[PDB]
């Protein structure tokens, strides 16, 4: 199962990726462009593509749609200024026929920050309930603690089997 992990810059995507893969916090390492990892979880080899979310390379995202079975969209729960930019990009992505069968897992990250929006608030700000004909899920997470991440993977695995 090929996983595209996307979201705005500074969201925590790389932190989440390495908390899940290595069980550790690493955070200063850059990401601009892409990360990818192969993550074995139960019966499934998840390949998670962590792609940079800077706006000027956001038009390139469409070359990464090939053979993708799952989408992780990561939003900085503490970043209210940019949550609608994330929403616009999500909706633009959901328009793409290549992703028509992709399942959607949202990680509401940085729940540890003082003004962090919660899973439900992110769900409302992003309009997830309006998403018709789409299997989706939102998980409140703190990448630096790892809370919620395996609940996300477990959901994703169960949906994909």
């Amino acid at each position: 199962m090929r996983i595209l992990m996307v979201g705005l810059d500074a969201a925590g995507k790389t932190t989440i990726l390495y908390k899940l893969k290595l069980g550790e916090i690493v955070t200063t390492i850059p990401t601009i462009g892409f990360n990818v990892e192969t993550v074995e979880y139960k019966n499934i080899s998840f390949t998670v593509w962590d792609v940079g979310g800077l706006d000027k390379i956001r038009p390139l995202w469409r070359h990464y749609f090939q053979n993708t079975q799952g989408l992780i969209f990561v939003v900085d729960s503490n970043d209210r200024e940019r949550v609608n930019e994330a929403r616009e990009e999500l909706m633009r992505m959901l328009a793409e026929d290549e992703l028509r069968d992709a399942v959607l897992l949202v990680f509401a990250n940085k729940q540890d920050l003082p003004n962090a929006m919660n899973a439900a608030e992110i769900t409302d700000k992003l309009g997830l309930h309006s998403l018709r004909h789409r299997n989706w899920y939102i998980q409140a997470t703190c990448a630096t603690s790892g809370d919620g991440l395996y609940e996300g993977l477990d959901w994703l695995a169960n949906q994909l089997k």
Binding site: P30, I32, G33, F34, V36, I57, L60, H63, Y64
Partner: protein, 1574 residues
């Protein structure tokens, strides 16, 4: 289809590689080659199933005795089918059924035909016979004549009509077959009847016999019914004629379509044949029928031309010959063709019917005497009359072009394509395994291979063994068939199964038993030095040894020595023993062929001896026996062979008596190349028995420590006979008998008996050198070389010795007995003692390289090490024009030589459509491409000459300057005014110009080299004359005045790009000049480039002389500049840079300059946006380089590749999106500056009429005279009167004051740039310059390219890459010295940006670009290294420190920190040198473009090397270095690789862009495909 099968194959591949020692048939592949290999695997598996196991089934079955009968063939086969209609499905079973079906169809048809034939014969004999009151007799038949001859004729006519109607039938049919058989019976009986009527009383009874003799015994078919069975479709037989080679150019016998007619290319061919074989020899042996003699199957093997031809023609001329029945025929028959010509028929086979030697001949067209002569055109026309024009074809033609490409090589096979093409071929026989013995063994369907040290044999299979073999092999293939389809589920080869591993353990030995290994099937075009041959020898080394053997053995130079040897040898009595050798008897037969007429005369002598034998046997005392009263074939054959042998050893001078009458023919023969070749091939075979007969003991004179003193470890072989290489060369069908057999000793058996003994120390040693191996250390060569002083009867000179020994080594390599080394080692042990002996060194050199080869690939360094030491001894007497030089070793496969014997001798006319172009040039140029290329790679074109078109393609024409006069307009040419190419530097005030009249009379067109990013500006000089300017600056039309026509960059720019391309010229039409702009482009075309018209916009635009053009452009330019300033403001805002205060400074003062205050804000803004984006992109450039490194790793299972394409696309987007903006900002600023300078100071400040007011960046730039000469000889600025060309035409007749032959090339080049001599004198001096230059480059460097490799080696170097001697930037002048200045500037960027991988990639590019001299890429490279000769940005990237002595240079490099580079830019040449220190310590690099690139770990070693190289061999003096000869002084120039990388080389390419893992046509593809598309 199954992915499991693909992964399984990949698994066993990876595993077998991991198991590799040195010397293995597996090696790592390109990720493309991977798939081609797997595809050939699958294909040959299908071939095995269809083509050998099937015939095995036909012997596991058929084991039981079904009803069998030669007459009931149809029934016998039918019961064999119904015996087996029950058998389970299996592809081999299906193939068996289908084979049996096809043979059932053929025999059913034939039996029907013969049945109705017999019934027709009986019917016609009843019709012609008398009443039963009398017996059938000639009297009653004669009485019947007047009626029944006319009856026969009438029936024949009716039948011919009705059958011609029936030929409309779509397939053979009972009616068709009926009518044909009847017609043949009627024809034959008519002929027999008329013969009876003509028969005399003594013959009359015989012809009556021939009438009553029905063929009812069925002893053979009627000939025409055999031809019926040969029919390919009802009423037509396929004729074929076999080529020697496919003769697309007429070099060979051929038959081809020419102008819709079929045309035989030559006047007769011995190789015609009719029909096609029904089945393979395999099936023939399975039926145990009579096999057709191999003299049908042997005679040729190259592609064949064939067509259906009307049967009447075949049955008319060729049925006279084609009867299979043994009717006596001579060697020849001559047949009158209906056009009054003869056809000559030739008994090319004395038994077989259906293969024919044919010659057409007749009254020679347009001759004084009616001599009959061979006539290809006559045969062509006659065939076209008798042939069908449909279904002409050539068989196997691409097979030749996809396996041999051409007549490839004069040596043994290297891959299965060369094997299957060789004369030894007959049919591809796979072998299979007999595993139920104690250990696995190989069997044919007919027999198991008995093997012995001396002998190879087969034991024929009894039924139980067949049942074993079949049941096992079928179980395996059934499993494989499941695996391809039912997958692991069906085959149960689960990843952990022990059965899976056993299965693979079986497959691997199958894939070894057949040579399906990669070296067997890949047959690449350009052989990487990693790949290995079918025996695990290095591939490229084998190719080089083959080219060596061919070149050596084809030279005529040693022959006076060899034939002196022969003249002595022939007197020894032991030579007779040679004749009873087994291999000798192969080749004297070819001498029997070459000397055929003399051989005939000899035999006419010899047949006397039989008469003397019978006479003596009767004269013998009281003969109790016909003691020799018989023709003894062996006696006469012996005497004949002895005569032929003697005539081969001694020269034609030995001919005497009556045979001198034919001696001129023999003389013409023996002096041919084939004569000399045979004449020596018999010598070296003759040599072995005499050498053996001395039995002198061994006594090597040079000791060797590594491998045992005083002995040699000769032979060193393990006997491991290959059954596949035996059976895939034609043994006798005695192997096929189903009876035990002992296989022949063919010459190749010497190639296939032996394998290296890995237990011997010598094997370990040789594997350390990694030579090729063939048959071990040649004890034969020792045995010969020990007695040379006795063969020649005296001591050899070391010259004579090495001559003989090289001829011997060539003979040995030619016949496949040994490697090079396997001979040269014992040579070095035996080289005679003498003042120039060299084997001692050669041994020490072997040891030196052994201790290396155990660690590193020597890449041929060994072979060069030998040739360096041998060659000056060989050429010791010769002139440099006559020296031998072998082909030259390279990373790519061996390239042709550049010297001596091997080179000695080893404008386009145009189409008159010029007149259409003159008559309607607008429509012509709208519908045709007009190119200008020939006006680029010629410098120094005349001011005035003849211009013509040459056509090249669909609407594609090329201009050329020509030498033919235009005052013969039939020259396809016109008076035109040429204009030279101007340079590309935007600082240039002095452009190329030429003046042409308004209302011209003398000529009506003007042409120039292709415009690319520049302008052609036409101005009205006076009431009657135009001045046309080629200005290299953009927007130049704004700068000139009185501009009446102009084309600027914007007019042909591809929007959103810097790219553009258009041809522009002037025409004098309807009494006025017209500026005609033909917009074009370069276009990619199958891994090549072409030019084309731009198709995305109007490809043509035309201006008549107008006045408003200046205003119309200038307003547009002002607005567009404003707009682009908006563009740049936008982009800068997008990257957050403050644009505050950025605006045009009012032009106040001064000349044009970069960084003038007026534009400084824009320049700063550009610099900043650059720094932002460069910092941005560098992070991806680095991560991409890291990923290429990652993908270089050997172990990786699978793709990681798509990340490369995604980074590539991202970066190239950034380039396309922003580089154009920054560059255009620079352009609009430079353009505005130049326009301000005009507006204030007038055009005369901004265009200058001549260059003599010299100015530039500084008053002089101290460019080497060499460099300033090369610039001065690849651009035209100003005119070139014709005397320059006259001088070049007569440069040896002309005289020049103050010059002599002993001036240096430097002082000539200097005096030429003084310009004092006349243009004709300057042309002559130029010619003399090139003459001197190439005479010196030859004398100084090519003749000594060998020793440098060894100097750099043993100075202690750590990596090297030789570079191609051959890459040139111009076909004329001194090719050698013009390329250095751009090359060093490219190399220093390559090394700084990509290290050893970059250097490798660039040298690969140069090699390909020199192997394809006119391919699109090599064109583009030539056009992109030019424009680095005088680019002022390179002077922006420089800082000329002083002159320095070498020691100081070394100390400065030692002083440098971080990467740094320096040119030496010696007075006539430019080495480059520099250091990297980034990791792995400090590596020091040195690079001389005449030799190669070398690297070093320490500056002491580096300096010791560079001193040895530059002063120890005086090259610094040939390069004109400064100061004393000893301790030479060099310039140096501290190149800044940080800026040089970004200089434009036109067409939007940065030097970085040529410096990358892709090809140029790749990068341009990506640009076109992501810029114009997307």
């Amino acid at each position: 289809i199954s992915k499991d099968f693909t992964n399984l194959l990949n698994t066993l591949i990876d595993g077998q590689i991991g198991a590799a020692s040195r010397q293995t048939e597996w090696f790592n592949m390109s990720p493309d080659e991977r798939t081609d290999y797997i595809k050939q695997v699958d294909e040959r598996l299908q071939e095995m199933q269809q083509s050998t196991l099937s015939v095995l089934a036909a012997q596991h079955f058929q084991m039981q005795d079904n009803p069998v009968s030669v007459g009931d063939q149809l029934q016998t086969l039918q019961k064999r089918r119904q015996q087996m209609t029950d058998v389970p499905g299996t592809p081999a079973i299906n193939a068996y059924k289908q084979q049996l079906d096809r043979d059932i169809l053929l025999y059913r048809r034939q039996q029907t035909a013969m049945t109705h034939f017999d019934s027709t014969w009986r019917k016609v004999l009843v019709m012609l016979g008398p009443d039963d009151s009398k017996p059938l007799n000639a009297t009653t038949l004669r009485e019947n004549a007047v009626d029944k001859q006319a009856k026969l004729d009438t029936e024949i006519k009716r039948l011919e009509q009705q059958l011609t109607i029936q030929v409309a039938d779509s397939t053979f049919s009972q009616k068709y077959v009926t009518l044909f058989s009847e017609l043949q019976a009627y024809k034959d009986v008519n002929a027999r009847y008329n013969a009876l009527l003509k028969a005399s009383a003594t013959e009359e009874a015989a012809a009556l016999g021939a009438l009553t003799k029905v063929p009812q015994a069925s002893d053979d078919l009627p000939v025409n019914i055999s031809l019926l069975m040969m029919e390919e479709r009802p009423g037509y037989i396929r004729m074929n004629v076999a080529l020697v080679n496919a003769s697309t150019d007429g070099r060979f016998k051929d038959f081809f379509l020419e102008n819709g007619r079929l045309v035989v290319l030559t006047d007769g061919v011995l190789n015609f044949s009719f029909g096609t074989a029904a089945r393979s020899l395999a099936w023939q042996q399975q039926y145990r029928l009579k096999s057709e003699p191999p003299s049908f199957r042997s005679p040729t093997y190259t592609p064949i031309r064939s067509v259906l031809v009307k049967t009447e023609f075949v049955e008319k001329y060729f049925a006279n010959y084609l009867v299979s029945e043994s009717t006596l025929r001579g060697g020849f028959k001559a047949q009158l063709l209906g056009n009054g010509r003869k056809m000559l028929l030739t008994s090319v086979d004395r038994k077989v019917p259906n293969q024919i030697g044919i010659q057409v001949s007749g009254q020679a067209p347009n001759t004084t005497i009616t001599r009959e002569v061979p006539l290809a055109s006559a045969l062509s026309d006659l065939i076209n009359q008798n042939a069908d024009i449909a279904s002409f074809r050539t068989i196997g033609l691409e097979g030749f072009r996809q396996s041999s490409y051409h007549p490839d090589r004069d040596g043994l096979f290297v891959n299965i394509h060369e094997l299957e093409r060789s004369v030894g071929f007959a049919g591809r026989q796979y072998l299979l395994e007999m595993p139920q013995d104690n250990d696995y063994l190989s069997a044919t369907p007919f027999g198991v291979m008995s093997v012995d040290g001396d002998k190879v044999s087969s034991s024929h299979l009894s039924k139980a063994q067949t049942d074993t073999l079949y049941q096992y092999n079928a179980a395996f293939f059934e499993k494989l068939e499941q695996l391809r389809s039912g997958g692991m589920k069906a085959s149960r080869l689960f990843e952990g199964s022990i059965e899976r591993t056993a299965f693979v353990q079986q497959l691997v030995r199958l894939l070894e038993r057949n040579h399906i290994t990669p070296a067997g099937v890949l047959a690449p075009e350009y052989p990487r030095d990693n790949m290995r041959d079918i025996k695990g020898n290095n591939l490229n080394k084998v190719l080089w040894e083959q080219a060596f053997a061919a070149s050596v053995w084809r030279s005529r130079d040693n022959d006076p020595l060899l034939f002196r040897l022969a003249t002595r040898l022939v007197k020894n009595p032991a030579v007779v023993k040679v004749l009873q050798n087994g291999y000798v008897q192969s080749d004297i037969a070819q001498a029997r062929e070459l000397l055929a007429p003399l051989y005939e005369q000899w035999r006419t002598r010899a047949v006397e001896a039989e008469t003397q034998r019978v006479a003596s046997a009767n004269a013998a005392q009281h003969p109790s026996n016909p003691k020799v009263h018989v023709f003894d074939q062996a006696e006469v054959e012996r005497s004949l062979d002895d005569k032929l042998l003697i005539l081969l050893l001694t020269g034609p001078q030995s001919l005497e008596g009556t045979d001198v009458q034919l001696r001129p023919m023999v003389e013409a023969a023996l002096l041919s190349n084939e004569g000399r070749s045979l004449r020596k091939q018999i010598l070296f075979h003759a040599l072995r028995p005499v050498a053996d007969s001395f039995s002198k003991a061994a006594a090597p004179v040079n000791p060797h420590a590594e491998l045992g003193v005083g002995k040699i470890m000769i032979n060193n072989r393990l006997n491991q006979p290959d059954p596949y290489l035996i059976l895939n060369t034609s043994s006798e069908e005695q192997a096929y008998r189903d009876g035990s057999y002992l296989i022949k000793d063919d010459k190749y058996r010497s190639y296939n008996q032996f394998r290296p003994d890995f237990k011997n120390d010598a094997t370990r040693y040789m594997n350390d050198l990694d030579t090729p191996f063939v048959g071990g250390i040649s004890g034969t060569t020792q045995t010969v070389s020990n007695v040379l002083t006795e063969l020649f009867g005296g001591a050899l000179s070391v010259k004579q010795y090495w001559q003989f020994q090289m001829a011997n080594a060539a003979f040995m390599i030619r016949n496949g007995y040994h490697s090079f080394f396997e001979t040269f080692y014992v040579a070095a042990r035996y080289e005679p003692e003498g003042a120039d002996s060299i084997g001692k060194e050669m041994l020490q050199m072997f040891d030196k390289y052994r201790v290396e080869g155990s660690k590193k690939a020597l890449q041929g360094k060994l072979y060069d090490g030998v040739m360096a030491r041998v060659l000056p001894i060989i050429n010791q007497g010769l002139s440099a024009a006559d020296e031998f030089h072998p082909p030259r070793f390279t990373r790519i496969g061996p390239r042709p030589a550049l010297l001596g014997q091997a080179v000695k001798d080893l404008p386009r006319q145009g189409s008159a459509d010029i007149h259409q172009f003159v008559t309607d040039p607008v429509l012509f140029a709208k519908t045709h491409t007009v190119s200008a290329e020939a006006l680029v790679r010629s410098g120094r074109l005349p001011a005035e000459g003849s211009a013509q078109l040459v056509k090249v393609g669909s609407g594609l024409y090329e201009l050329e300057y020509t030498e033919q006069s235009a005052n013969d307009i039939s020259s396809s040419s016109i008076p035109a005014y040429f204009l030279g190419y101007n340079g590309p530097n935007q600082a240039n005030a002095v452009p190329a110009y030429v003046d042409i009249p308004k209302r011209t009379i003398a000529g009506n067109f003007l042409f120039t080299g292709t415009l690319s990013g520049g302008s052609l500006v036409v101005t009205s000089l006076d009431a009657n004359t135009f001045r046309v300017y080629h200005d290299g600056r953009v927007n130049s039309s704004l700068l000139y005045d009185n501009v009446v026509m102009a084309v600027d960059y914007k007019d042909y720019q591809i929007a959103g790009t810097a790219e553009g391309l258009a041809a522009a010229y002037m025409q004098y039409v309807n009494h006025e000049w017209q500026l005609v702009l033909q917009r074009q482009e370069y276009q990619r075309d199958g891994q090549m480039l072409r030019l084309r018209l731009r198709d995305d916009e109007e490809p043509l635009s035309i201006q008549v002389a107008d006045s408003q053009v200046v205003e119309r452009n200038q307003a547009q330019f002002v607005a567009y500049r404003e707009q682009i300033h908006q563009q740049l403001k936008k982009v800068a805002t997008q990257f957050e840079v403050s644009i505050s205060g950025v605006s045009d400074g009012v032009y106040t003062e001064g000349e044009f300059s970069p960084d003038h205050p007026a534009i400084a804000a824009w320049a700063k803004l550009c610099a900043e946006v650059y720094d932002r984006i460069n910092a941005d992109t560098k992070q991806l450039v680095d991560k991409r380089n890291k990923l290429y490194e990652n993908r270089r790793n050997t172990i990786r299972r699978d793709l990681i590749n798509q990340q490369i394409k995604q980074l590539n696309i991202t970066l190239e987007y950034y380039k396309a999106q922003y580089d154009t903006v920054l560059r255009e900002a620079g352009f609009v600023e430079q353009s505005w500056l130049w326009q301000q300078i005009k507006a204030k100071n007038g055009s005369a400040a901004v265009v200058r009429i001549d260059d003599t007011a010299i100015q530039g960046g500084g008053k002089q730039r101290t460019d080497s005279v060499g460099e300033r000469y090369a610039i001065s000889e690849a651009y035209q600025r100003g005119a070139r009167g014709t005397g320059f060309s006259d001088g070049l035409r007569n440069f040896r007749e002309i005289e020049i004051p103050g010059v002599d032959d002993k001036m240096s090339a430097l002082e000539m080049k200097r005096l030429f740039l003084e310009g004092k001599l006349t243009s004709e004198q300057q042309g002559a001096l130029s010619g003399r310059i090139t003459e001197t230059s190439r005479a010196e480059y030859i004398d100084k460097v090519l003749r000594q390219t060998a020793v440098f490799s060894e100097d750099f080696h043993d100075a202690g170097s750590v990596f090297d890459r030789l570079v191609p001697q051959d890459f040139y930037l111009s076909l004329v002048g001194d090719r050698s010295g013009g390329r250095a200045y751009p090359l060093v500037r490219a190399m220093t960027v390559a090394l700084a940006s990509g290290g050893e991988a970059g250097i490798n990639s660039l040298v690969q590019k140069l090699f390909f670009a020199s192997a394809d001299p006119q391919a699109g890429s090599s064109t583009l490279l030539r056009n992109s290294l030019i424009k680095l000769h005088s680019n002022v940005e390179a002077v922006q990237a420089s800082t000329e420190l002083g002159q320095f002595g070498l020691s100081e240079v070394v100390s400065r490099l030692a002083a440098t920190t971080g990467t740094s580079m320096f040119a030496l830019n010696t007075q006539n040449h430019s080495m480059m040198v520099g250091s990297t220190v980034t990791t792995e310590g400090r590596r020091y690099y040195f690079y001389d473009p005449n030799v190669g690139i070398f690297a070093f770990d320490n500056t002491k070693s580096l300096s010791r090397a560079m001193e040895q190289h530059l002063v120890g061999r005086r090259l610094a003096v040939h390069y004109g270095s400064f100061g004393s000869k000893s301790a030479p002084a060099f310039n140096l120039i501290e190149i800044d690789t940080g800026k040089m990388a970004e200089v434009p080389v036109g067409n939007g390419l940065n030097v970085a862009d040529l410096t990358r893992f892709e090809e140029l046509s790749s990068v341009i593809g990506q640009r076109r495909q992501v810029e114009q598309v997307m």
